[PDB]
Every structure is written in C-alpha cells, then in structure tokens.
Amino acid sequence: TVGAVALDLDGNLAAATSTGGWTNKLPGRVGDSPLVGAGCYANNASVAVSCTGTGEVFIRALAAYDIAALMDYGGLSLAEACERVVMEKLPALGGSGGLIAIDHEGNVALPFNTEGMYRAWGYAGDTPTTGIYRE
Amino acid sequence: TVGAVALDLDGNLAAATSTGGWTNKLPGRVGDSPLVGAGCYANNASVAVSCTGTGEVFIRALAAYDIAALMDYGGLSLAEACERVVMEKLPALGGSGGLIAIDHEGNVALPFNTEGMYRAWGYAGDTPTTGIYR
Amino acid sequence: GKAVIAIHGGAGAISRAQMSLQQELRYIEALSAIVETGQKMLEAGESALDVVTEAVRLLEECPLFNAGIGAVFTRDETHELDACVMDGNTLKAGAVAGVSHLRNPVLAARLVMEQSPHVMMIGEGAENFAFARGMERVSPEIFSTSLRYEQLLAARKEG
Amino acid sequence: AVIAIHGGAGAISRAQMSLQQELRYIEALSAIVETGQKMLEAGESALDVVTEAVRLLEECPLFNAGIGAVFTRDETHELDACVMDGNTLKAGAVAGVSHLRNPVLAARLVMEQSPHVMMIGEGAENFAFARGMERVSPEIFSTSLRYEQLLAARK
Ligand SMILES: [Cl-]
Ligand SMILES: [Cl-]
Ligand SMILES: [Cl-]
Ligand code: NA
Ligand code: NA
Ligand code: NA
C-alpha cells in the first residue's frame, strides 16, 4: 500500500492508492486500496484521503469516506476526524494502519496507530517533511 | 440487482445485495452491489441499506453509507436521509435508481427516483406491502 | 421497533403501459412469497443476518430478478455475478464480485463474511475459496433465461 | 497547495533496521514528495500530482506497489489501485491485475475512458490493452527483499 493526496493551486483535491496486497495473500482477496470510500476518496468540498492497513477493517469502517462524513455531517475538524477513525474506530474492529488526508482548507494529517508509516508531506515552495516512526 | 434489509427481535440490522450487473456489460466491470457502503451497508447504530441503480454513481456517492452517516452524524431521520441521497444527491451526479432501508427503530423507506422499483416489505406478524410503480 | 423486512428486485424504467395485471401479479406474487418467508422467520426469532441471506437467496433463485437465476447476459453472452452481505451487529461483511460458477453469490458472500479474515474476494479466487469450503461448482449456463437473452438481442445489432 | 504521500503502515521496528536502510526510504519519500511539490508549484492539477506520486511509489522497489509488490501465496503478484478526482467526483479503480506495470495509470484509464469506477482481473487488463497500455509479465515486480519476506512470513 502506497498513496498520495494533494490540493492544487485551483483548490482541487485528488487521492490515489496503489498496492501489491499483503505477503502470502491467497488469490483474489481484495483489501481497501482499490475501493472508493475505503482506501481512497476525494471531494473538493471536504477531503482527499488515502489509507494503508488491515484491509477488511478499512472496508467495514469505510475509513476514507468516514473522514469526509465526520467532518461534513459531524462538524469534526480534520484532526478530530483522523483521531476518531484511526485511533478509536479502526482498533475497535481489530484494525491496524493509518492514512493521509488533506481538507479543502489545506489542513494535512498523517495519522497511524502502528509502529510506523512511511510518509512525507510539504506545502508548495516549502521544505518537505518525512517520517517512518511515531512522534 | 436484488436486495433485502431486516431488523430482528434482538434489535439487529442486516443488509444483502446480489446482481448480474447490466445487459451487454463487458467482462470484469464491477458496480455498487458487492461494495460495502455503496450497494450494501448495515450498522446496528443507524441503518441497513441495499441499493439498486447506476453503479458508478452509487459508488462515487457511497449511497448506502451516506444514508447511515446522515442519520448517525447529521441527525437526519431515515425519511430525510433517503430524500437527500435518492432525490437530490444521486440525480445531481447522473445516477438513477433507489434503495431500501430500515433504521434501528424499525422505520422503513423504499425511495427510488426511477419510474419503478420492484419492492415489498412487511412487519413480522403483519400482511406484506408490495409495489412496482410510484 | 417491530421486526421488519424489506426487499427489492431492482429499480428502472418500469411503466404500467408495458404490462398486464396478470404479468404484474407474477412479480407481485414472487415479492410477496419472499417477503412472507422473511416475515415468518423474523416472527419466529431468526436473525436479521439469516433473514436477508435467505431473502436474497430466494431472489437469486427467482428467474424474474437479475441476480443468480435470471441474471442479465454480458457482451460475451455469459453471466458475471456480484453480492455483498453485512451484519450491523458485528459490522462484519462479505462480498464476491465477478463470479460465474456459484449458484448463489449471496451464500458465497456470507461464506467470505463468516469463514475468512477478508471482506472481498473476486473471480476464480472467490470461486476456489467457495469450492474449498465445499460449495458446489455450477455451469454459468444455469443462470440463462430466454427473457434476458431476448433483452440482450433487442439491445444490440447482429454480426 | 500541499501534497502528502505514504508508503504503507505497519510493524516497522528500529532494532531490525539500520540507518542506511532507513535513509533509502527517507531519500525515496523525499524525492517523490519534492517532485509533487514542484508540480503543484508549477500549477499542475491535484489529479496529475497524485497520479505521478503514486506512479513513482509504484516504480520504487522499496514500496509495496508496482515494482516491489509483495508476493502472493502462489509466489506471483496481484495489484490494486484507485484514483479519485475531487473536482468531478469521478474515480477509477482496478483490482487483481498482474499484467499492468502501473496500476494507478490503469485506474486513471478506467476513470477517464470508461463509464465505470471499477474493473477486475483480465477484464481490467484487456480494457487497458485495448487503449494502448503495455502488457507486462508479473515477473517485472519481483524483488529479492519481498521474496525473503514471503519465506520469513511462511514461518
Ligand atoms: Cl521517523
Ligand atoms: Cl504495528
Ligand atoms: Cl550509518
Ligand atoms: Na434471480
Ligand atoms: Na514499488
Ligand atoms: Na496471466
């Protein structure tokens, strides 16, 4: 699982997710990566999200869309929505992983409940930030 | 496409959807029916939904989950959420079809924006209601 | 709330001008029989999961409806079937897409839910999972109906 | 304007990984996010930026997508991808593909050149090939690192 989210100069949001699945996977099993609203979602009016983790839990919890709906309908900020999904709801179903998100206001979040998540972000015309481990 | 939603005496919701897709479909195309939150969703906290319609729009709209999220987070009634998704949001994206939904209080909705939808529902120990047209 | 079931057999351009009452009652009778089965099961204390599974299984069996027996034809004059089931109690789900050799995709979806750590399986992988758990292999021809074959022909040119 | 990328979440420990090992990932993430930043700075679309970032993460054998995909039980590769455009709410996705070098470009193709969101398996592949995408052998994805991780995971 790899992914990208972006907000362009025109205010467009976009998300993309790509994966090889998981080591020793049986044939024809599908996780969250190719599923709209589970592993990948974008709407100019809310957020762009790409996910990575226990596929079945990201599907059951519709993780990517749940970020948008918690913000849109629940009035949560991006930070609050990410905390709710990644640190509460995913573990509640036995689910490990993380996600990257940008909202329409340019807030960026890279929540994960795992030992690490390969990640990076940067604003245009700024130095990028990278990370592997927690805090 | 076919589906069923139900609430049982223990207060559990469930949803199931099944399809052969669309006449003259090219191989390997997947619509909303097998996709959680698109053609099928159930949560004891909100609603059970089974959809039928333009698969591409029901996926892009996360039609089934959007009903649940409008009720759970937005505090919309089942009727209001069904109106919003089926009569407003889906048509705005070029999607025709409908859905069946039961909430955790046993409210039932069978919204559709098409000419017809083969549908029926009934309370346990009651006579069933059947329909095709508006 | 009172235990309750709803079913659908698909939404589309259905108009009164197109059918007789006797032709309508064929659809009404099928929907009534299946919803009545669900109602009786709910009244006897059966689970919402077991009721929707059986209701969709019956809708698959019913040739009038575009799932299982009575599936529409693909471009290639075969059948590709998809199904999902979700349990609101556990939030477990199971789903199969693109299967042609399973009589009842909803039962295969329910097998994915109950007898795997995965939500979604596709094509031959989904089929082989189902066969390894003892579900019967079928010819895709079993789904084929004159009604749907005629719809395929009216929708295209011959050559 | 802003980009964020990931190359997967899970049980990364420090006691197992050297600094030179870690720096290869840091340098890889750096170059890709920087490529994205420069595209955004130049006024390229969010869609084109996430497509190119994920294409680069696919090409990079360090990340479990495209080249450097994990091995299945049967010691081959099955790849999945999705792309969504927030401007149109259009989306494209492929699942279970073995003969497409860059699943995210296949997904973008489903988005733009089909009325569908999602294609699977040989239907997805034949759809892409019918629009001039190259057929590849899944052997191109295979790496020693991921083979070694398959043998380890079997224990
Ligand atoms: Cl770090
Ligand atoms: Cl971990
Ligand atoms: Cl060093
Ligand atoms: Na049928
Ligand atoms: Na790669
Ligand atoms: Na092959």
Residue-range domain boundaries for chain D: 19-153
For residue A45, the domain's CATH number is 3.60.20.30
Are residues D72 and A98, on separate chains, in Cβ contact within 8 Å?
Answer: no
The two structure tokens encoding residue A16: 């993309």
Cα D23 from Cα D10, distance rounded (Å): 18
Rounded Cα–Cα distance for residues A53 and A59 (Å): 10
Contact between A120 and A130 under an 8 Å Cβ cutoff? The reply is yes
Residue with the two structure tokens 């390997």? B28
DSSP assignment letter at B12: -
DSSP secondary structure code for residue B113 in this structure: S
Residue A54 labeled ligand binder:
yes
Residue A126 known to bind ligand: no
Nearest to A36 among D12, D49, D82 (CB): D82
Which other chains touch chain C, taking contact as 3+ CB pairs less than 8 Å apart? A, B, D
Considering every ligand atom, which ligand is closest to the CA of A113? Answer: 2
The encoded tokens of residue D14 equal 């420090």
Strands, DSSP E only, in chain A?
Answer: 2-7, 13-19, 29-30, 40-42, 47-53, 97-103, 108-109, 116-123, 129-133
The shortest CB-CB distance from A29 to any of C91, C93, C125 is to C125
- Choose from A19, A54, A78 for mutation: most chain D CBs within 10 A: A19
SS3 string, chain C, reads: CCCEEEEEEEEECCCHHHCCHHHHHHHHHHHHHHHHHHHHHHHCCCCHHHHHHHHHHHHHHCCCCCCCCCCCCECCCCCCEEEEEEECCCCCEEEEEEECCCCCHHHHHHHHHHCCCCCEEEHHHHHHHHHHCCCCCCCHHHHCCHHHHHHHHHCCCCC
Crossing angle of the two packed helices C123-132 and C105-114, in degrees rounded to 10: 70
Cβ-nearest to A4 among D1, D10, D53:
D53
- Alpha carbon distances (Å) from A3 to A28, B67, C63: 21, 28, 43
Dihedral over Cα of D58, D59, D64, D67: its sign:
positive
- The answer to whether C9 contacts B21, with C-beta atoms less than 8 Å apart, is no
Give me the resolution in angstroms, 1 decimal: 1.7
| DSSP letter assigned to residue D139 | G
What residue in D sits closest to A41 (Cα-Cα)?
A: D84
Which class for D111: exposed (0-12), middle (13-18), buried (19 or more C-beta within 10 A)? buried
Whole-Å CA distances, C23 to B3, B8, B42, C72: 22, 33, 33, 19
CB contacts, 8 Å: A33 with chain D: 80-82
Q: CB of C140 within 8 Å of any CB in chain A?
A: no
H or E element: which one contains D35?
helix D19-41
CA distances to A120, C104, D90, D99 from D53, in Å: 11, 41, 19, 21
How far is C-alpha B29 from the chain's CA centre?
Answer: 21
A29 φ, ψ to 5°? Answer: -80, 140
For residue D149, the SS3 value is helix
- Rg of chain A's alpha carbons, rounded to an integer? 14
Residue B32 assigned as binding residue = yes
- Do D12 and D6 contact (CB within 8 A), yes or no? no
Helix, strand, or coil (residue D33): helix
- C-chain CB neighbours of A55 within 8 Å are 118-119
CA–CA dist B15, A130 (Å, integer): 42
Return the amino acid letter for A54: T
- Among candidate residues D8, D56, B31, the one with its CA nearest the CA of residue A31: D8
| Cβ atoms of B83 and B69 closer than 8 Å | no
Which of A28, A55, A59 has the CB atom closest to C122's CB atom? A28
Q: Are A55 and A32 in contact (CB under 8 A)?
A: yes
Cα–Cα distance for residue pair C91/A19, rounded to 1 Å: 24
Q: Which residue of A has its CA nearest to B56?
A: A36
Q: How many distinct structural domains can be found in chain A?
A: 1
Sign of CA dihedral A42, A46, A47, A51: negative
Flag whether residue B93 sits within 8 Å of chain C, measured between CB atoms.
no
Contact A61 C117 (CB under 8 A): no
Residue labelled with tokens 């909202």: A103
CA distance C6 to D106: 38
Does the distance separating the beta carbons of B65 and A62 come in below 8 Å?
yes
Contact C15, B124 (CB under 8 A): no
Beta strands C120-122; C93-99: pairing state: parallel
Asked whether B121 and C5 are in contact (CB, 8 A), the reply is yes
Q: Do D72 and A21 touch (CB under 8 A)?
A: yes
Closest-CA residue to C138 (of C153, C127, C149, C148): C127
Q: Hey, are the CB atoms on A114 and D12 less than 8 Å from each other?
A: yes
A55 at D interface, C-beta within 8 A: no
Q: Given CA atoms A54, A60, A61, A63 in this order, what sign does their dihedral have?
A: positive
A1 is catalytic: yes
- Which one is catalytic: B1, B23, B129, B130? B1
- Angle, CA B100 vertex, CA B96 and CA B106 arms, to 5°: 150
Q: Are D65 and A33 in contact (CB under 8 A)?
A: no
Query: Helix C48-61 to helix C105-114 angle, to the nearest 10 degrees?
Result: 150
Chain-chain contact of A36 with B62 (C-beta, under 8 angstroms): yes
Rg (chain B; Cα; Å): 14
The DSSP bridge partners found for residue A29 are: C121
Residue D63, SS3 per DSSP: coil
Per the CB < 8 A criterion, the answer to whether A74 and A88 are in contact is no
D127 vs D44: CA distance, rounded Å: 27
* Residues with Cβ within 8 Å of residue A54, at least 6 apart in sequence: A90, A94, A95, A96, A97
Smallest CA-to-CA distance from B17 within C53, C121, A105, D6 is with C53
Q: Which residue of C has its CA nearest to A59?
A: C119
Give the three-state DSSP class for B21: coil
Contact criterion met (CB below 8 Å) for B33 and C84: yes
Q: Which chains touch D (3 or more CB pairs under 8 A)?
A: A, B, C
Domain containing B99 equals 2-131
Kindly identify which residue of chain D lies nearest to residue C98, measuring between CA atoms. D120
**Pairing relation of β-strands C4-12 and B116-123?**
antiparallel
Contact C7, C38 (CB under 8 A): yes
Q: Which ligand is nearest to the CA of D24?
A: 3
